[PDB]
């Protein structure tokens, strides 16, 4: 029963996970990866310019 309630909480932890998927560090790391891809797209844009 302890493991049953524990795995119930672990399954409910999807809310914790997808709420962490909009946190400050999430935004920071997504923005730095997007900034790498964005500087790639930029240098492309300015070369075409």
């Amino acid at each position: 029963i302890h493991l049953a309630e524990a795995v119930e909480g672990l399954l409910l932890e999807v809310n914790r996970l997808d709420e962490l998927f909009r946190q400050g560090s999430f935004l920071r790391e997504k923005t730095q990866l997007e900034a790498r891809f964005k500087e790639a797209r930029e240098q492309q844009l300015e070369a075409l310019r």
Partner: protein, 49 residues
Amino acid sequence: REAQEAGFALSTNGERLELTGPGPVPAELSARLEEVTLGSLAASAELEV
């Protein structure tokens, strides 16, 4: 009080946790923000349980 240590104000909207103030907040401040957010969502889950 963690935010007001550096002189930063807070405006939370329930699920969303954020603070108002010019300039970048300390890294420890953002870490505490995310820790408090995770704890709040967890305690929410156990309150439904």
